[PDB]
Symmetry: D3
Subunit: 171 residues, 6 copies
């Protein structure tokens, strides 16, 4: 009903599950109930470096909706929906298979601050490296999980990934 | 379904969209989905001086539900509903037309702290002026928006405005 | 629809109404609408010492769902659902009649931190006493309310209370 | 060095030790080092309902500086100094002996909001009662302490208490 | 004692007085005692969009130390010292006289994030405009004050202002 | 001035530099000025899982004061002093050389909660592992640093380390 966005994949809707810079409570929405659940408390002393959530009405390679990191000037509360522009994607493989993480900034009607951020490489490399580091290490204390983090790909690649996931949801 | 309140306009229900004293994330509910959206991040370094939301099942002069500023001792989270007593209304005209802002305090069963606050003029003038100032200036960096702030009117006037909006919703 | 949990009473679902260590805004869910309401601001300068909420699809002795205090490492937001293991119950009588408060910790899949907490008596007595103190005094400024706090009972007793409330909900 | 205030007792300086509405970490300054110490974490699930600190260069009846509750619109950080106007005093006996807690608001030059608060009785009774309840119950789990809370006295009384304490510090 | 910085004006020391994105409590250090004071609560519903403080051992044109806005990824507590790189300066006249606010980011050794910010014009224009708006309107409710905001000047200009202020403090 | 503690090494004084569970601003005190400095913002998306500070008037093997992780129920502000009981020590080598991080809880007089924590092994293993993981990975993006984390040793070992460091500071 919220949908992936009328202008997808150029701008997409993201339902936030975890706020930027929050305590490590990992919420997740249930598709059945529509309820927000605590999936876990992260066992590592790490925090999500962006707001984190998913694009409704998408099926990514691993069967779940596409996950998105939304960089913003302030945290967005879990359960809120935000319109965002994909700027890149971090490829990674984990215990679920292919589990890429799209990186996005707010749509310009939501905040003009990130207007000149078009690809992930327009952001500081140290910040991009913090994201890679986060996914590389946040699951290290969970013995049956693992993450092998790959490379960043550009906004175009992130948009094609989203396109594929939207088509998978229609099928 | 929540409705404007069984004792409207003397006490009314307000669905909170923005918490008092919060970072400038302007959430808004969608009537279609029922989802909370990020409308924008305020471009100005301002914050809502009260909790802010709307009375369900109302149609104000500008076609939207009546907007209410709810002064309280602590912030109320977005999406929560609170029963409040109108104490005044700040008249203003903006890019949407007539866009008055009702000022309210919690109903006495919710908090007796504001029991002797009956009209807006029972609150400090500096606080009332901060509200006028907020609406006067918070949109200054958005070129196609504008606000011309008028005068405060008393609790009786605020209640009649609400009555009109409730009747408009029935029609 | 969320239900009391497939493994109830050994592990149960709790819908959080008030976050641990929060300002004293007492939210409550409405069964009719499904909306979160502000019931009141506590008139006393006290705060809930654990996350606080209820087990869906239960009818306790006083006609309401079973109330649960969920101890966790971080606050859980109101409206989130968490899977918990009961560890004890504090008996008390108040203006509603029998109003016991179950004490729980997260299920081990949610956080292994509390793995060796099996009964309430595995927690510090000073903390248990803070809970008794909270219910003893938080309503003292509300003249028509009262609480007479009894003794703690063990995890087994808490589970049987929950069982009874689940059976009452089926009937 | 900071001193009690050039306009004492009409306006006095208070060094804040505990922020209003904060987690129950009770800091205390030490006069020897000027260091801020954690005296204790409150065992009870209570919080200071006003900012709390002391007037430098005073010796109250019990040998310590005059303690002051400073009501303000926002919390003030421990170690900051604020110029305040006494509006009343709450008499109490405790394990410091014959004690008293002055109630104050910021001086008008610091915040105009409370400029019309002349005496403690200009604040809501429900809030004054919350302060009395706080001192009556916050130490109840510490059986090596006790608090017997008396009555409120007016601004003139509070100022006289302060006058004497300043005189006592001069001698 | 702390001094303006061994590498000034390329990197300078700033003692923080107000945290970025905080409640509008405007602290100020006093040079006599070294005490942090509450100067005021802002009457307006605005917040400092950067951390805000001063360069020790400087005398700007108006007689006070050089004031600096320090943009950072997280707020810095009042009283902390941070090593920063000036990137520009916002000229303004106010009730302190011919004033100026230096804009800086942390030195690269403190945070790599802003290492590519060379001049104020490398930051988003929408944010620079937010800073100008803040100074233009934050004092509007204090009719004994006024602010006339001028133009931004570049990093080289900011550094020259600082050079002169250091020289002035030496003489 | 503050000193290591009259009851050292059974209870020691720790000056807090970083609050538990805080944003990754790593403050450090300077012994020359007594000023609190921002050393860095952590490049990684990690947070200190305990309060973190040092024991005054100690010289550990590597030349610096003894560093201490203080687990507590709430964060303690930087610059505050707290009396703690050592319960263990985590050995590690890093760019400071042969390092060690003492683990402590508040003294019983400060909080009764941890009164039954005698050794590090009385705390949950999952949490001890989180501490080890923090030191193993928090500096991974700083290639001019490295951390090789060793084993936990018991309270008696921690106290002996502290004893030696105090002796070293006396000589």
């Amino acid at each position: 009903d919220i949908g992936s966005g009328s202008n997808a994949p150029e701008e997409v809707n993201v339902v936030i599950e975890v706020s930027q810079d929050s305590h490590p409570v990992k919420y997740e929405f249930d598709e059945k109930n529509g309820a927000l659940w605590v999936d876990r408390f992260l066992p590592t002393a790490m925090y999500y470096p962006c707001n984190y959530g998913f694009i409704p009405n998408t099926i990514a390679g691993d069967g779940d909706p596409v996950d998105v990191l939304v960089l913003a000037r302030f945290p967005v509360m879990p359960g809120a929906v935000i319109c965002v522009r994909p700027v890149g994607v971090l490829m990674m493989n984990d215990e679920k298979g292919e589990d890429a993480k799209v990186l996005a900034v707010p749509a310009t009607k939501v905040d003009q601050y990130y207007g000149n951020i078009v690809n992930y490489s327009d952001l500081p490399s140290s910040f991009l490296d913090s994201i890679s580091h986060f996914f590389s290490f946040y699951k290290k204390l969970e013995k049956d999980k693992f993450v092998s983090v790959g490379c960043w790909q550009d906004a175009a690649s992130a948009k094609e990934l989203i396109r594929s996931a939207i088509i998978a949801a229609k099928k």
